[PDB]
């Protein structure tokens, strides 16, 4: 019964349905706050003063916003209450007529409140779970969410882990509530030693809703461990897609920049919300988007971005941070998609998400219905080392990355049954590296004029004759998309050095491998498209959806030397970045 | 996988590169002014750290206990600067920056490039009780990117950094700089680890 | 059949599974880089305070943002063990100590 | 019942408790070694010579050392024994507690 109800609740979450939620627990569930001035008088059947936003309140305001599933809640949380007290509460013996119960008890039980022992806690939490299932409610058990990031509630969390394993017998979904503030500042999220403030409870509720939308209720859920390219409407056991507004166009079009052709689109003049929820099994992850459109697309990645009443200044510091202070300053949420029509077909680096836990990536257009369109063709979430995580590209900080090298042999050395003829290296096309892309072209300007908005790449060319050529590809002039190639080190003589080396930014054109209906009626059903490696258009001359490339033109003073060339393009890139992303 | 750092074997790693743009290219609604590159702080790379300082000695005296890092500097004017940051002297924590390749003329080459090992200081983003009684409960601390102390002068818990000081023979050139610090590191190493 | 060392390895790995939380059905092997501290509870790394004297106190003197300074006091024998299933062929071990 | 007992055992391992462990199996569990000179005479109810350290012995010496959970073991391992023999062993029909 519990598994069936949890499956129904998961389908309601992912189908814009409605769920009635029972919030049962102690002071942490009730939203206890008696320390800060960000309080509201005791409500929801509790005696203690509550924070201005409790976790159930934020859950009920957040899950409908990010998934479209209407949430109505019943409060069965009293400060200082234990499992024995909760089971025998006179007003809680009736069925609240809900669909899912989110149960978090054990902090007060570990303190010996009401004579509670570990065995009593275990027995009465099991009894509560059975009673909740008998009431037709799916059971989501939480570990004891407390303050101090593991420094407090050790016995409470041991009992909570035992209770979670016991609840596995009943097929209960679980939420590791103790780790919702692990990557945050304690001062920013706590009212007292063990209770959260409004922002901490908001974070807890938002992570709970993130687990709901990610498919964490499902027993087949797996946290995101490697890079994934997901699109609107994609079904994975790691990333849960929610169409909150129900108007994301899952239509197939050749105008998409992905091979899945899903153009998942936010129509102009309507408020569309697309959210991707997952458990990030790493300390950090780079967020990339293949998106185009005219109207503003807004991305919210972490906690203070969704809700913040501004009651404390420090609520802004409550975003997920790196655990270690070393060379990791305070992280601010930076999730921007640059909608430059110049790079519309190109990948955009949204930003980074820090911390291990449940994450929601909210993609929404103008909520007032006065904005343009956005097409969320694909979303890339790439877990990275936290020291390699980039908050904002080319920002006021030193971004630690690796040296991405684009290697090619001219002529190719693969499957050459006979020795290939030596060729002259006068023209080749290498993918545009990350360091050369503009940062926020819509705001800071494109490379065409603001030729500082790019970085540099080193073109290392060597041939079988021992001749070496190190070329600094850097933009010194504006008015175009040409990178001046300055020769740094070469084994060539001055009369043998190439006179001018030109790197021209361009996009590959797209070509049809098989037009729809080429082989006959409806064979193939759809056009099978590919990037045309032979057709590339300079930026500004035309638009190409095949990817950012450099048209490298080497001009030789005399007849071009012929040899077997090794071409390497060295440039800075984000760790493990698959595509150069604006 | 590295068994022991700087041991009797060849440790296979990758080339960790610390990239920064001076001035930054992020969210520049207006074109930033060209700046002179005379001082910047880059995190200390792994290859430059001492191996077993308690046993083999620190870089202050045993200036062999460190390795080298290559500082590759390029600007929007096309000027390139490849600097070998290596420790040639003892008695301090200063790495001698030898210029390997530069597009600058001899009279335009920087006279002395100094990489000084240092630790960032720690600063309080929000002292405990700043907003009122118990708000915040605890001090929210961060590394002070503006305050760094040379090793031996003082102790800092903000991470190992290099205080790179570039001395120019004439007035420092102003341009849009691309700074890359190339050094050996363990594959995917997040922090330079002693 | 194993020798003394092989049986010792088998028993030590069995105890490693016990301490890692491998008995639990929610256990997951360690697949990516993790920054864990004393007293941290994860489904991948099992922390055991063998001697029961590791100080899980919070101090600004810690070099981590979690402020857990998990400490082995002087003049007392303290044992802190971290157990996990490594889902890779190798792993680099780093400490902020 | 098995899940509840395994949860209790996991909590004992991670809480410096005490567990009584039954080591049931064949020659590999008993620590069979009749090839090397690193042997000890047949003990723990087995007929075959054992290695100087068997897997259960190392488990009982290792888990308390690394987790603080005291371990006491009962040996029900005989070399050459199968599941049918183990189930119908006359001396193994009693509960080892």
Author numbering:
A (entry chain A): 196 to 777
B (entry chain A): 584 to 777
C (entry chain A): 390 to 486
D (entry chain A): 196 to 292
List passages from the publication reporting this PDB structure.
Because we could not resolve the highly flexible side tailspikes in either Moo19 or B2 virions, we purified these components to examine them separately. Genome analysis and mass spectrometry data indicated that the tailspike was a single protein in Moo19 (gp82) and a complex of two proteins in B2 (gp48/gp49). We used a similar approach as described by Subramanian et al. and purified gp82 alone. We also copurified a complex of gp48/gp49 as previously described. Using cryo-EM, we solved the structure of the isolated tailspikes to 2.4- and 2.3-Å resolution, respectively. The tailspikes most closely resemble that of the tailspike in phage G7C and differ wildly from the tailspikes in DEV, which more closely resemble a myophage fiber. Each structure is a homotrimer, with individual ribbons colored cyan, green, and magenta. Therefore, we tested the purified Moo19 tailspike gp82 and the complex tailspike from B2, gp49/49, for esterase activity using a colorimetric assay. Positive esterase activity would result in a visibly yellow color and increased absorbance with time. Both tailspikes exhibited a rapid, dose-dependent color change, indicating esterase activity. In G7C, this appendage is hypothesized to expand the host range; however, Moo19 and B2 have the same host range, so the function of gp81 in Moo19 is unclear at this time. Three major structural differences (see cartoon representation in Fig. 3B) include (i) the lack of the tail appendage, (ii) a single tailspike for Moo19 and a complex of two proteins for B2 (see next two paragraphs), and (iii) the completely different decoration proteins.
